[PDB]
Design a protein around this nucleic acid. Structure first.
Ligand code: MG
Ligand code: MG
Ligand code: MG
Ligand code: MG
Ligand code: MG
Ligand code: MG
Ligand code: MG
Ligand code: MG
Ligand code: MG
Ligand code: MG
Ligand code: MG
Ligand code: MG
Ligand code: MG
Ligand code: MG
Ligand code: MG
Ligand code: MG
Ligand code: MG
Ligand code: MG
Lengths: 155, 59, 114
RNA sequence: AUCAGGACAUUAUCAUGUAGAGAAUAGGUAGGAGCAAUCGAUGCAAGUUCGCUAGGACUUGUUGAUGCGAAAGGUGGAAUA
RNA sequence: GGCGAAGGCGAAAACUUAGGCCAUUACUGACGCUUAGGCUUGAAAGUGUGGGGAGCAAAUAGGAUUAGAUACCCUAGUAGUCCACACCGUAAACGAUAGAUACUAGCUGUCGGGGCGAUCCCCUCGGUAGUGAAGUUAACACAUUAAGUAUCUCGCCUGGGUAGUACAUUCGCAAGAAUGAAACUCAAACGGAAUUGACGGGGACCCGCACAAGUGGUGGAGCAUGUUGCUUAAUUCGAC
RNA sequence: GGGGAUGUAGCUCAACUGAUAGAGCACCUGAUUUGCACUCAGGAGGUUGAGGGUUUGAGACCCUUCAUCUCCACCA
RNA sequence: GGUUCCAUGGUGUAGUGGAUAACAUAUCUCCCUGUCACGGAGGGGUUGCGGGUUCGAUUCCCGUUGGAACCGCCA
């Protein structure tokens, strides 16, 4: 009903590790329109990652985020009662987006201390396939596997 | 309604089997519902008219 | 223990049935959407018919037959998914004969729900 | 009177068989501490035993002159001719 | 597409039997059309007696849905649907167009008989359809199978509701059928056709932070402000 | 009185003749509704009645008690 | 006249073997809709009277009201 495809703004290559993805997650943890604050928090977590995992921070971050990243997406389609779901293959741009959105949401709910250490633990906790983001990805995947039958009819 | 596979390929069998089943399904579904005799003649007459008019323009 | 045989595949609009049988009578194994674990409305979806065919195909292939006459039946919706399921299993489909009961104007069918 | 069937008793049939640990299927006791050799080594092939799908013992085929660390060595509740 | 006056008639065969089309150098010589009364037939449902009953399903029972469901859905389920003999005689029994006769452009199909002789196609005589001018109609439309130009005969109509009701009569075992008003009431009628809009849990197409994808909020707490209600001497009036 | 049973989670019942403490429904959160439910994911809930012994070990095997369930005989 | 039963929220009914009172409808507030019904969330409201026993009575006991159900015969 629109017939027009929206444009896309540049993602920008990261300014430190030269890994674009850092800028996206920075904007995701953004609150109150604070570019500065968000950068400080996030970059500080890498210093803790060095101090803790004794490995390169960019490598740990890619291994956590790429692993949390899902494959199937279940789109709600109601006809008469409740909704029968439809599993569809997500594009690559949106693929990365759900992982970053999910990483931040479970980071701001942990029982830990300052979100600096909170988000640091979440990223290190997702590199070993044992965390909160994993369970979410597992749950949506299992629903899709359960709902493999209705995949042929989409709309 | 036997159709031999010929054992040369499989698809060809289903390309003929699709047609055979569709004409088979028409009568199979027809002798599923009871219409009065007047209504039964109406659907028979209805299908013939559709097929006729459609056949006129491809010939 | 038999090389050739018959597999009746009935596809009701509400459910499906796949019966593997000897060239004459005496079915050797059977499977259905209900026995797979699907319940209620999902039993009438072509995907379930393909799933039922895969298990029965696996069971009977370990028993060891090559040539299969496929007696397709019913007027459901997943009438071709089970056929294709056997083909990817690799059994030799020899005939695609159809034996859905057709009447010659015998017995009055039930009333139409409206 | 006869036939067929399974009930439950058997005459008579001996592998079975699965804590960890132990190299091990450990069914319980081999009395014990080396013993078997046409009272026939050893070898690998086929079937079967049952399964704790790893392994088990047994039969058949090769079949011939040293095997048996299941005697002595091993750990274990249970043990090595 | 065919047949029959209509209802209706579709596996195969036998027997009995009805009507129709074409050509007639044959025959009778107006013996023809219509039809009040009368007679015959007349879908399905229903009735009476005796058989039959696989499937289906009024009535009925249960499970659902629902605010309620004596309904739509599902599972059961009797009468009935079937046959023979007796009734009932009503249907949107419709081509919503009584029968008969003569005339009035044309084109495209299709069926049967006859003429020619491969069909196919051409012509003649009829049945059944579509398109179409004069003509008719309020319009839609009919248009050689008329709702056109005319004749014969029969049946029927005279505003709507009361009302196809009531009484009387005839038929019927029964339900009922035929016939059929009035008192009272209204200015019109669930009148006909067509036009412009609106609407549709009717289609087709196209738009907007509409949905979808996100972000931050509101509805929960405290406070500021406005409104409703209540009160008061007044809580000025308006905006809903 | 005699025989046979049982006691395992909040509610019922499996176990397994000795080596797992389980299944289902109730309760709770998540996905999901117009709701009500159905469905789907996760989670807890136990001296395995008590007492004694077996076995290297037990809830189980045995012995004895407590409680309920069954039965199955009855001339004071 | 005699005997048995009952009295619980606004209306229809459960429980309590003394220590405790719920269900539905109805009612109220808020979503819901142009509005209303229906729907959703949340909120609320209870032992006929008397008199004894008990530390404590809706419950246990005896009386007093109201409403029912049974009987009231032989001559
Ligand atoms: Mg039906
Ligand atoms: Mg009839
Ligand atoms: Mg009922
Ligand atoms: Mg039925
Ligand atoms: Mg009847
Ligand atoms: Mg009439
Ligand atoms: Mg016309
Ligand atoms: Mg009048
Ligand atoms: Mg009349
Ligand atoms: Mg009227
Ligand atoms: Mg109009
Ligand atoms: Mg949205
Ligand atoms: Mg507020
Ligand atoms: Mg508030
Ligand atoms: Mg004011
Ligand atoms: Mg005003
Ligand atoms: Mg509101
Ligand atoms: Mg007396």
């Amino acid at each position: 009903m629109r017939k027009n495809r929206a444009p896309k703004r540049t993602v920008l290559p990261d300014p430190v590790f030269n890994n674009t993805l850092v800028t996206r997650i920075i904007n995701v943890i953004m609150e109150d329109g604070k570019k500065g604050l968000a950068q400080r928090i996030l970059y500080g977590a890498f210093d803790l990652i060095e101090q803790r995992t004794k490995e390169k921070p960019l490598t740990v971050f890619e291994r956590a985020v790429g692993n949390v990243m899902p494959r199937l997406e279940l789109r709600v389609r109601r006809i008469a009662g409740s909704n029968y779901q439809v599993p569809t293959e997500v594009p690559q741009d949106r693929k990365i987006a759900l992982a970053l959105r999910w990483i931040a949401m479970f980071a701001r709910k942990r029982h830990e201390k300052t979100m600096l250490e909170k988000i640091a633990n979440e990223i290190i906790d997702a590199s070993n396939n044992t965390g909160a983001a994993i369970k979410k990805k597992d749950d949506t995947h299992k629903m899709a596997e359960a709902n493999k039958a209705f995949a042929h009819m989409r709309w | 309604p036997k159709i031999e596979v010929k054992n040369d390929d499989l698809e060809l069998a289903l390309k003929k089997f699709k047609r055979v089943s569709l004409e088979i399904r028409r009568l199979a579904q027809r002798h599923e519902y009871h219409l009065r005799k007047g209504m039964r003649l109406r659907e028979k007459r209805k299908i013939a008219q559709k097929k006729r008019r459609k056949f006129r323009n491809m010939v | 223990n038999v090389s050739s045989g018959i597999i009746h595949v009935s596809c009701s609009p509400n459910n499906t049935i796949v019966s593997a049988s000897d060239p004459g009578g005496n079915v050797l194994c059977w499977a259905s959407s209900g026995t797979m674990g699907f319940k209620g409305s999902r039993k009438k979806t072509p995907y379930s018919a393909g799933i039922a065919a895969d298990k029965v195909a696996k069971t009977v292939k370990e028993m060891g037959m090559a040539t299969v006459k496929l007696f397709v039946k019913g007027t459901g919706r997943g009438k071709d998914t089970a056929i294709r399921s056997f083909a990817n299993a690799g059994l030799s489909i020899t005939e695609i004969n159809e034996k859905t009961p057709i009447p010659h104007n015998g017995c009055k069918p039930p009333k139409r729900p409206r």
